[PDB]
Amino acid sequence: VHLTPEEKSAVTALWGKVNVDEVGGEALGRLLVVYPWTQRFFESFGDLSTPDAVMGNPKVKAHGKKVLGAFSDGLAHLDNLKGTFATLSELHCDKLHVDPENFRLLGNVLVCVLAHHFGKEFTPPVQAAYQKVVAGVANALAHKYH
Template sequence: MSILLTHPCPSPTPGGGPLPLTNSLILLGEGRTLGQEMRNKRPHSEEAAQTCFWPIRITSKLPDTMVHFTTEEKAAVASLWAKVNVEVVGGESLARLLIVYPWTQRFFDSFGNLYSESAIMGNPKVKAHGRKVLNSFGNAIEHMDDLKGTFADLSELHCDKLHVDPENFRLLGNMILIVLATHFSKEFTPQMQAAWQKLTNAVANALTHKYH
């Protein structure tokens, strides 16, 4: 469900007053709570400063505690991971993210043609980066008891240098689940889904650890 609201846009220049009211899109995901207050975000580019069209998602942040995985959950995740074609699943997951949530394309300007669904699905840079992203999940599976330590450097990179909205990590995790369910319909039981959902949520939370 999408709700269009208006709010003051932060000033693009230091010391300046707020710009006139402008529209911001707030996406309410199914099953999300409305407890988290919207945060003001300063645009990361001149174009963004002029339009100030920001995707802000109201969501509940995962508790800042260590996530414990049972032996059964670890075994379930590892058993499916052993069958995953990282290039295919990673590429499809990132492509779905760019198609379903098109505002995420602004982080991939160097990827070239992202103007249509077919262009995104066939884009070699999308496939390559998707493989790289999913490989990081392989690293997570090997370090499920220390995800925050494992992703500390990536969290700092995405926060301080790339300025990625942390909600995008959760969105990508959802895309990975959908693609896994598509490729492994029989193996992707509710129990398997629960284990992978727990992992993707924990990875997303670990990636937000360095955010202020």
């Protein structure tokens, strides 16, 4: 159900080139632009009135750094995603009330951002590896919902 050894190597190698703060702000910004209903959690974040305003919003960027920072840390535990994200799963269900579909939308946006950032280096096999990863993280974050 998992990544092959070569797919794990490919994920790790590409991720070593990622500016996590930059990619995180970009992915969260794009999530709020492309799927604007995801803004429902961020009414306290200020100006989200235009795409430029969302992308430039420092509270959006700050949350993107925090979310993708935890994503990035989880890539060290590709064989224990459910365990690694269990307590964040309970938190997103019990306190934050985040529909897990948001995790899957963010995973899709992240793949698009990696494709945009890395261009031809984001080959079809590398994408396939990252699709397994973002699906696994989303499934892990959703696993303690009740």
